[PDB]
């Protein structure tokens, strides 16, 4: 949604179209920036490792659990 | 305690007109928003028409008063084009506002506006195409295409469209006006076996039944409606008045003295020929028995609209006397039938010598379907009347303003004077119809105006706008048109209103 908003198109409609395409043909396309439409990623030479997402998600979940488990009162000196 | 003359007065007038312009704006398209209006009494009403809202609102401003007066005059003289003229005037004022504070005399823009209006009128007259009995062989194909265009505005059933076409074609005899405000329409309540029925005559509503109501004949050979304002109820007549109470013989004496005059009056009013009594007040208990004993007809509880329709169809005369009547101010019918359907008793007055009104019964057996789905048939019959009466026609929608704006913009590039910017602003201000039509439907007008301008840059056809499919299609093939005479009058009225607004420079007040 943030990418579609920064590109200059309708974010809700693009998100709904992407969800429909994912529910229909599983792996279809994504969001393009250079052309400004919905094109397949297999033509554009752009990839990223899986660690940059797995480690990020694990760190975010750990931080959320740490900030949720901390409560009570915050005493000071 | 402060007042000016010139630029501040015009600015104040524009600001006052903008209020009444923004007050009514969303009610323009076919699916506009509703508005609830209530006064100091305590009763509220929901309406969506611009004329009803403008009629139930008063402004203490001279410019707004003149504007609403011009709008009311245009709506009364024509019948279509009340909010569009106001929006055009508001856009013209908004475009002329920045070209006033820069030190410009408004006496030089009136000529430019008049020339632009004349050029637009000439272009519309030279671009309008009329067709009326010149092709499509016999008129059967013409009426078939007319019915198809009538049913193309709203997606309804085929039988309903056929019944609407029949009820709109079976009423074209002596009607020579340009509006359906003569015969009118009336929505009934209840249910039946079929979906819709048609009949020629005056209809009626629910009638209260009593004991022995089947004594009157159901079919009449030559009935005559008794047009008498007096009624025969227990409250009207009397059997005992101011008399000395002693025994029972005085009661019989006074009741006979009253019944003598009653019988004289009834035989005098029945000897003229009238036998179908249509009393306004409901009947009692002994009046029905007295009417059935004399082999006559009785009724009660009838509205004024039904009486007016009966007087207009059967040709009755207004009688302002009870007794001493003649046999020339009475009505004459032919066939009077009483048929009960469901949980009500319906009446049929078929055989009127003056074929004027016709009943179009629309009962499906529900309580919400009667009130709803009532504007579609009205729009269909209005389009049918406009296509039958008027000769000139053009493609409707937002396909006639863009071409005029492009023509004005192309013509403004061949004048070496101060009128160039004036004509440019006049052409730019003409784009307010399709943008508002797209904004009222919850769409994106920015994605459609660019496509319309790209298509009208070199095509010049009848490509308008869509609502259902949300795209750009040809309005000439969508079976939607509009007369080429209302737009000219609306533009002329808007130009006259703009000139009258820009001509006022200041006001003069007087205490005493």
């Amino acid at each position: 949604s943030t990418l579609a908003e920064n590109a200059g198109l309708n974010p809700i409609s693009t998100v709904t179209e992407l969800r429909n395409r994912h529910a229909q043909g599983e792996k279809t396309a994504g969001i393009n920036v250079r052309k400004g439409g919905i094109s397949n990623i297999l033509e554009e030479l752009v990839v990223q490792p899986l660690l940059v997402s797995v480690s990020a998600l694990t760190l975010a979940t750990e931080t959320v659990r740490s900030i949720l488990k901390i409560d009570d009162v915050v005493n000071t000196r | 305690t402060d007042s000016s003359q010139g630029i501040p007065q015009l600015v104040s007038n524009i600001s006052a007109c903008q209020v009444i312009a923004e007050a009514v704006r969303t009610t323009l398209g076919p699916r506009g928003m509703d508005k609830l209006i209530v006064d100091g009494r305590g009763k509220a009403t929901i309406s969506n028409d611009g004329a009803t809202i403008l009629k139930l609102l008063d402004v203490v401003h001279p410019a707004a008063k003149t504007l609403v007066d011009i709008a009311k005059s245009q709506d009364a003289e024509v019948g279509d084009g009340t909010t569009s003229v106001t929006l055009l005037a508001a856009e013209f004022l908004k475009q002329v506002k920045p070209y006033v504070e820069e030190g410009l005399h408004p006496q030089i823009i009136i000529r430019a506006f008049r020339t632009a209006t004349q050029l637009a009128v000439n272009k519309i007259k030279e671009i309008a195409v009329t067709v009326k009995k010149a092709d499509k062989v016999e008129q059967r194909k013409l009426l078939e295409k007319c019915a198809m265009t009538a049913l193309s505005s709203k997606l309804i059933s085929q039988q309903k469209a056929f019944f609407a076409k029949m009820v709109v074609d079976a009423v074209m005899m002596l009607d020579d006006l340009l509006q359906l405000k003569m015969i009118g329409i009336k929505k009934v309540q209840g249910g039946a076996l079929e979906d819709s029925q048609l009949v020629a005559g005056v209809a009626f509503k629910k009638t209260f039944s009593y004991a022995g109501f089947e004594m009157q004949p159901k079919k009449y050979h030559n009935p005559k409606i008794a047009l008498l304002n007096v009624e025969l109820e227990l409250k009207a007549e009397k059997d005992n008045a101011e008399i000395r109470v002693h025994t029972v013989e005085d009661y019989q004496a006074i009741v006979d003295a009253e019944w003598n005059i009653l019988y004289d009056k009834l035989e005098k009013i029945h000897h003229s020929g009238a036998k179908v009594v249509l009393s306004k007040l409901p009947i009692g208990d002994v009046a029905t028995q007295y009417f059935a004993d004399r082999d006559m007809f009785c009724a009660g509880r009838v509205p004024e609209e039904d009486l007016k329709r009966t007087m207009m169809a059967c040709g009755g005369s207004i009688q302002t006397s009870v007794n001493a009547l003649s046999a020339d101010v009475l009505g004459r019918c032919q066939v009077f039938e009483e048929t009960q359907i469901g949980g009500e008793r319906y009446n049929f007055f078929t055989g009127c010598p003056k074929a004027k009104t016709c009943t179009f019964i629309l009962r499906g057996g529900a309580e919400q379907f009667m009130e709803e789905t009532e504007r579609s048939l009205h729009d269909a019959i209005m389009i049918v009347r406009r296509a039958i009466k008027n000769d000139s026609v053009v493609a409707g929608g937002g396909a006639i303003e863009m071409e005029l704006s492009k023509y004005l913009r192309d013509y403004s590039r061949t004048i070496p004077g101060k009128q160039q910017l004036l004509i440019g602003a006049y052409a730019k201000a003409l784009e307010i119809i399709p943008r508002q039509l797209c904004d009222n439907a919850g769409f994106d007008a920015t994605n459609i105006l660019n496509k319309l301008r790209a298509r009208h840059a070199q095509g010049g056809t009848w490509y308008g706008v869509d609502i259902n499919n949300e795209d750009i299609a040809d309005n000439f093939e969508a079976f939607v048109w509009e007369p080429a005479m209302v737009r000219i009058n609306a533009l002329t009225a808007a130009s006259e209103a703009a000139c009258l607004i820009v001509s006022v420079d200041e006001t003069i007040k007087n205490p005493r």
Binding site: G8 | K418, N450, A454, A457
Partner: protein
């Protein structure tokens, strides 16, 4: 936040741009600047105002920095860029407020600028001279302010065009260089203004107080000397350590006996007259007058520098100090052809005929006001600048404000033919181009609403009916509010300057529009 700081930056840019607005063109009022001390400076130059002005806004600071960076490499065109950027910002503010992504209008502005550059690059002039520099009757009257004399301006224009076309220069071995610029002048008083002559070879300073040279024969070449011999000390070269109270009376005779061989070697081949500055004695001249060798006095540093930079005969290669016992080479010898002192303007000046390398013309003024030295000098400077800027680069455009209308019309046509999301941006860019003719008409005390309308109506005919591309390009006038053809008598301007100015303005507008918030994050 968001849409507020952007409006504030736009307002600040408009306020800082509405200061040098009433100072564009040659007709403008003056501006006073105070340094918050007590002194006041009156100037009407846009560059001097933009350079001497306090700033405190980041957007204004970066705008001034970009303007300075543009002015460091481009001569003129540093004032209209700020107005163009302000107009672009005030036109894009409404687009942003109308719920439009700034990337769309940025791409539209980029496409409009590219289309304008492509259309400009296809409208140039191949010829560099038309019947002798615009018929040599129109290219000199517009570049010369005639307020006291104008009846006999044809002769002055002919003299100017002759002086600028008869002499050329070439040194880069790739393109013809500009001719002479620092020509010699002679201000006279009480002369016939209705008569003027042109002679070849510039003259030096007037010899006053030492005109005892019987010039009767025609010489060949001459020489030059920077220092001067003297008994006692006076200039640089005399030693201060040698203490001799009796040798000072015989140092002149010793120096003469030493330089006798040098003078004898100079007298060979063809060299007689030498050039010596002030500080020489008359006894040496009286002793050398019997052999044929003399010396012309009244020599300054400017004349020596001009001689060294003209013919190329340098002296530093061999001589440097007072030691005159150096080698004898042809570097310190003025190889000329004829040096005669004719009778001109009732005077006897050094006249060098047939000068090598360069050949300058002696421009002698007439008896009038002292301002005549500032009347033809500016015209000659403009002429040499034109012939040096349009020579190596044939990218010139006619007029000054007659090209924005056609560009705006072409941009509007392209926006109408496009029909995409970047449609209103090109229209706004085309509308934001009529700010220079309007300002020029306002500063000239004329009606801009009628002038711009007439200019657009005249320019639309050249694009509707394709008939020609060189004619039908009329523009505005400075004398009165009447359209005049800027081809037969107009002044051309370099197109590269305008292209760079437009590119810098577009870059500044894009940079300002790309700035979101200014909060300390």
């Amino acid at each position: 936040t968001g849409e507020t700081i952007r409006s504030q930056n736009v307002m600040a840019a408009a306020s800082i741009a509405n200061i040098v607005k009433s100072s564009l063109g040659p007709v403008g009022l003056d501006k006073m600047l105070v340094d918050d001390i007590g002194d006041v400076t009156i100037t009407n130059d846009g560059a001097t105002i933009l350079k001497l002005l306090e700033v405190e806004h980041p957007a204004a600071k970066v705008l001034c920095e970009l303007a300075d960076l543009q002015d460091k490499e481009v001569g003129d065109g540093t004032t209209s860029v700020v107005i163009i950027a302000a107009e672009l910002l005030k036109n894009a503010d409404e687009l942003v407020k109308q719920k439009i992504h700034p990337t769309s209008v940025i791409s539209g502005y980029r496409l409009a600028c590219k289309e304008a550059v492509r259309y400009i690059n296809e409208n140039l002039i191949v010829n560099t001279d038309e019947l002798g520099r615009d018929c040599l009757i129109n290219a000199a009257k517009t570049s010369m302010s005639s307020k006291i004399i104008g009846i006999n301006g044809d002769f002055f224009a002919n003299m100017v065009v002759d002086a600028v076309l008869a002499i050329k220069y070439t040194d880069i071995r790739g393109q013809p260089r500009y001719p002479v610029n620092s020509v010699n002048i002679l201000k006279a008083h009480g002369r016939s203004q209705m008569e003027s002559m042109l002679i070849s070879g510039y003259a030096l300073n007037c010899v006053v107080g030492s005109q005892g040279m019987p010039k009767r024969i025609v010489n060949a070449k001459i020489a030059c000397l920077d220092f001067s011999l003297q008994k006692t000390k006076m200039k640089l070269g005399v030693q201060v350590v040698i203490t001799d109270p009796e040798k000072l009376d015989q140092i002149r005779q010793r120096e003469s006996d030493i330089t006798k061989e040098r003078i004898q070697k100079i007298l060979a081949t063809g060299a007689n007259v030498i050039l010596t500055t002030g500080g020489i004695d008359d006894m040496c001249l009286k002793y050398f007058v019997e052999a044929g060798a003399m010396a012309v006095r009244r020599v300054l540093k400017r004349d020596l520098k001009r001689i060294a930079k003209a013919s190329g005969a340098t002296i530093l290669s061999t001589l440097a100090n007072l030691e005159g016992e150096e080698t004898f080479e042809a570097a310190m010898l003025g190889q000329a052809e004829e040096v005669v002192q004719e009778r001109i303007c009732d005077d006897e000046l050094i006249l060098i005929k047939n000068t090598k390398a360069r050949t300058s013309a002696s421009i002698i003024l007439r008896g009038a006001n002292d301002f005549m030295c500032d009347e033809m000098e500016r015209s000659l400077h403009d002429a040499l600048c034109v012939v040096k800027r349009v020579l190596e680069s044939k990218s010139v455009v006619p007029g000054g404000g007659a090209v924005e209308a056609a560009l705006s019309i072409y941009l509007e046509n392209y926006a109408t033919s496009m029909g995409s999301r970047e449609q209103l941006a090109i229209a706004e860019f085309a509308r934001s181009l009529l700010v220079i003719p309007n300002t020029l008409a306002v500063n000239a005390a004329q009606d801009s609403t009628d002038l711009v309308a007439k200019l657009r109506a005249f320019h639309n005919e050249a694009q509707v009916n394709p008939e020609r591309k060189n004619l039908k390009w009329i523009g505005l006038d400075l004398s009165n509010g009447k359209p005049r053809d800027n081809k037969q008598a107009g002044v051309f301007e370099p197109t590269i300057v305008k292209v760079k100015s437009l590119k810098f303005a577009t870059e500044a507008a894009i940079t300002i529009l790309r700035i979101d918030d200014l909060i300390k994050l």
